[PDB]
């Protein structure tokens, strides 16, 4: 299951309720084709890795969160453990996404 985030408070609350778990956040936009192409694979990871928390943030819904997160290229994947950012990259690269998860979990 992928968390759909629709405020900065929900984002912060999610990072807090994570406990010690890896949190993976997909920042995407509706105009970003590859963002829409990777979305099912993103959902698959959330079903596969029930141990890891997956969130989606749409940058035009959550402009504050998008700005604060210093997002530049769509999609961007950020990774958190205990409220701290422990990884980031951009681009719809499935293999890299999963590899990154396995390094951080």
């Amino acid at each position: 299951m992928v968390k759909q985030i629709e405020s900065k408070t929900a984002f912060q609350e999610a990072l807090d309720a994570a406990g010690d778990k890896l949190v993976v956040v997909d920042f995407s936009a509706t105009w970003c084709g590859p963002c829409k192409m990777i979305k099912p694979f993103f959902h698959s990871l959330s079903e596969k890795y029930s141990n890891v928390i997956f969130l989606e943030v749409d940058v035009d819904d959550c402009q504050d969160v998008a700005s604060e997160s210093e997002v530049k290229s769509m999609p961007t994947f950020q990774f958190f453990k205990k409220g701290q950012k422990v990884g980031e990259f951009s681009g719809a690269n499935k293999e890299k996404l999963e590899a990154t998860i396995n390094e951080l979990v």
Side-chain angles (χ1 to χ4, degrees):
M1 160 158 262
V2 184
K3 282 313 71 176
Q4 189 76 43
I5 298 295
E6 289 297 349
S7 66
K8 178 168 179 178
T9 62
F11 183 63
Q12 302 168 134
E13 250 129 51
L15 288 180
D16 295 346
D20 77 342
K21 294 166 168 192
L22 195 53
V23 181
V24 181
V25 189
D26 178 353
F27 289 87
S28 284
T30 57
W31 51 263
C32 170
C35 292
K36 289 167 304 181
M37 89 184 47
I38 205 168
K39 168 164 178 277
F41 180 70
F42 196 75
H43 279 280
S44 91
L45 286 173
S46 75
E47 292 165 346
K48 173 175 187 175
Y49 292 89
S50 50
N51 46 310
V52 167
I53 294 173
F54 296 77
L55 323 175
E56 298 256 23
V57 169
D58 177 286
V59 296
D60 294 292
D61 277 357
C62 294
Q63 289 176 359
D64 60 340
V65 173
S67 184
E68 292 166 19
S69 299
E70 297 178 347
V71 172
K72 39 200 37 160
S73 326
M74 289 294 92
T76 292
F77 300 92
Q78 298 186 342
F79 294 83
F80 303 81
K81 282 195 273 179
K82 297 184 126 203
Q84 306 300 119
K85 192 157 84 194
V86 299
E88 188 169 348
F89 71 91
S90 58
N93 180 329
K94 291 175 180 178
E95 183 169 285
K96 181 188 279 163
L97 177 51
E98 185 163 10
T100 304
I101 290 171
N102 288 308
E103 203 273 338
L104 288 172
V105 71

